Ligand binder design. Sequence first.
Ligand SMILES: [Fe+3]
Ligand SMILES: [Fe+3]
Ligand SMILES: [Fe+3]
Ligand SMILES: [Fe+3]
Lengths: 124, 124, 124, 124
Amino acid sequence: MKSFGELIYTPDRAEGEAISKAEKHTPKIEAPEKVKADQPFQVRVSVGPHPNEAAHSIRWIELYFYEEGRPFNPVMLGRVAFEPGYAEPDVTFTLKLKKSGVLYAISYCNLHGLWEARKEIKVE
Amino acid sequence: MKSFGELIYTPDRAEGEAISKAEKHTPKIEAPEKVKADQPFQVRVSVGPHPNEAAHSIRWIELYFYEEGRPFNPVMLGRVAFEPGYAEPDVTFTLKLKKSGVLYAISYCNLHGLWEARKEIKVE
Amino acid sequence: MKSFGELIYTPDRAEGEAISKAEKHTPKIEAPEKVKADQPFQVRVSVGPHPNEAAHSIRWIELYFYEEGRPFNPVMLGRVAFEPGYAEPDVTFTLKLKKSGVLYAISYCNLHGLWEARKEIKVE
Amino acid sequence: MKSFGELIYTPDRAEGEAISKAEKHTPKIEAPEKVKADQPFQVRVSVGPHPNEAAHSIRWIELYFYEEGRPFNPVMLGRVAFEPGYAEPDVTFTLKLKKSGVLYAISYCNLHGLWEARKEIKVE
Ligand SMILES: [Fe+3]
Ligand SMILES: [Fe+3]
Ligand SMILES: [Fe+3]
Ligand SMILES: [Fe+3]
């Protein structure tokens, strides 16, 4: 059968899809490569160009984090939901990290499923 | 008895509370007074200074909108949830409006309940 | 102007609406009148009959609680979101209470807004 | 590096974990093996025994569905969030399916991460 984690469009097989000739679902993560510990910084997450209507939109974005050295992983950092037609799939968070790891962005399209983005962030 | 809508701390009786000597829960809405129709703009919502830990944080922010002339109201625009300790209660949305109305921000504190902010926005 | 809490259709002015000739939005709360402290019980929340499609559904239900004697109120107990067309607006929670108070149910319709239901529960 | 989908504890490597000597995180899905199309049925999802407190609980459960023959997958069916200490990680949904596939349950623990359960459902 198939596992849930396999269902997710990784950014590697995100380019060789027929729907990525019309609309990008893979989230774009804007965030500094290095930050200071306990210091606040911005992370922007956005998807586009994609339609935005009742019948077809990015419904929500999930932001997770793999913390290096944490016993279990990942930690979910935030979740934002967008109203189709009113809100663009574009959001800025403010974060404080203690340790290095990887930011993950998950976008959900009501027609096109779950799309993943990854970004390394070091904490010095 | 008491109705749900009465339970919410309005920004009028938000100043005469004993807990607003230690921490502000009333959301701050940053958004243009006037925008063009169908044109995208930023709305920032933030709460602070408030603690941010497992035992005590702003768990989530809801962004709603009263659309003038819409038969029923309001329209929920977005919802963001923050992980205690990692995410600051500070978020930026991107919106497209068609008609004038009022932005509402609702913050939730796990100890201190529901707090409301209001901001008029005109669409010309 | 108008406050957010006033926008919510109470179950009193829920009967004298023109849309309640076609569809009920006011949640139905099924829960025992009295429970024992720290003891688990079921609470069912449902809305209907209402359409359930992409263009028109109950998007989500929020369950809150006014705890008698708690310094601030209310406590949000749960939140469930339903996929239009697949999930019925019908959910059962399991709760443990320590003190008496009032359960509140909030349903959201993407066309028809926010609807409220109230149910007293005693903890002996 | 590692992909997001790999981070998720499958129910296969869920038994050979040191924390499954103290608490089960893998969701239990109760649902009929076969249902009729467009006909409503119950799906119960629960996690336990697990602690339920501010510092440590199942925060939320996501219910997804792989629809056989659907161009893209999966469809998210529902999402429920539980207040630590008040709500048990136990929820019942009502669903209508049109086509056969697989139900997925994802539980989130604030310490122990993401846990997966799978259940085949036929629509005749
Ligand atoms: Fe799409
Ligand atoms: Fe507070
Ligand atoms: Fe309706
Ligand atoms: Fe755990």
